[PDB]
């Protein structure tokens, strides 16, 4: 009962598909169906009664963002055409445009430990690994079903989690892609997000209205979390050392502690409409979180007693 609620500490008044903090939790960026990446200063948003400091127009609708963990000013995007772009938010220019995917790319992630490396996944059923110093993909994994999410392990660039429309999480060692290390079954519908709490703890979300926790050292199921409604949309998943947060098709943000299967708290986003939460992001291991919904509203929330 350390926390019982989420307090709204700021609000910026369509769909925001991604909201992410930079390397220092100083700036954050949003992107979505409006074909624009917007960058905001977190402290200005919290202190003021609102305007992005940078906006970059894109050719296609955006599905995902990932900031570089070493180069402060670099951010990757994935788009509905399949293009994976690395941008510099100071110059506004695209640095790399990776165009090998043949269909919509749903996810991109920059590695924390080898920061020139990034991974993407697509409706074309491929996972591609890229290096910012090379135009062609470094690794290609041909899979059997649409890839909805990819994420690097936070401790090593050799491991990625891949969430698939086949309902499973495929956990790969990129040093030998002939077979995954392990494939985690349990979800009853597509796996829409994968996020690591730590080197050995992986969380997932699915359109079976569950989150699940997995042990990637010993290849074990750990826990299933329930309470929210997620049968259709990408509603967002974010985790830290202790907590999982996700969206819902009821326009509510849910928070779970990793040891407890039902929610610690929830927040009705408000504005009538069938809105859905569409993106969430913790501010590292703190109780502060960014959230956004299908109307494009952004809120800064904080877990509170």
């Amino acid at each position: 009962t350390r926390y019982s609620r989420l307090r709204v500490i700021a609000e910026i008044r369509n769909i925001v598909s991604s909201i992410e903090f930079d390397r220092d939790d100083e700036l954050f960026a949003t992107a979505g169906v409006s074909r624009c990446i917007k960058v905001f200063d977190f402290s200005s948003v919290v202190n003021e009664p609102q305007c992005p400091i940078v906006e970059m127009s894109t050719r296609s609708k955006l599905s995902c963002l990932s900031w570089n963990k070493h180069e402060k000013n670099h951010i990757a995007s994935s788009d509905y055409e399949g293009i994976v772009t690395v941008w510099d938010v100071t110059t506004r220019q695209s640095l790399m445009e990776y165009e090998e995917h043949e269909k919509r790319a749903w996810s991109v992630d920059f590695s924390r430990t080898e920061p020139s490396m990034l991974v993407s996944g697509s409706d074309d059923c491929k996972v591609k690994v890229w290096c910012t110093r090379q135009e062609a993909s470094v690794i290609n994994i041909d899979m059997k079903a649409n890839i909805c999410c990819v994420k690097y392990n936070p401790g090593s660039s050799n491991y990625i989690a891949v969430g698939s429309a086949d309902h499973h999480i495929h956990y790969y060692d990129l040093r030998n892609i002939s077979q995954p290390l392990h494939v985690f079954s349990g979800h009853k519908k597509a796996v829409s997000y994968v996020k690591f709490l730590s080197n050995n703890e992986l969380a997932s979300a699915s359109t079976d209205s569950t989150l699940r926790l997995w042990d990637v050292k010993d290849n074990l199921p750990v826990r299933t979390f329930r309470g929210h409604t997620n049968e259709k949309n990408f509603v967002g998943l974010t985790v830290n050392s202790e907590y999982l947060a996700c969206g819902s098709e009821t326009n509510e943000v849910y928070v779970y502690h990793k040891e407890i299967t039902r929610p610690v708290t929830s927040h009705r986003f408000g504005s009538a409409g069938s809105y859905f939460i569409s993106a969430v992001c913790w501010k590292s291991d703190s109780p502060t979180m960014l959230t956004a919904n299908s109307q494009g509203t952004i809120k800064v929330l904080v877990l509170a007693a």
Binding site: I15, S17, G32, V33, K61, S63, D123, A145, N146, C148, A165, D166, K189, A190, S192, T207, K232, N233, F234, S278, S294
Partner: peptide, 8 residues
């Protein structure tokens, strides 16, 4: 369709 998870 916008931000709808694929269902095969």
């Amino acid at each position: 369709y916008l931000q709808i998870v694929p269902e095969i």
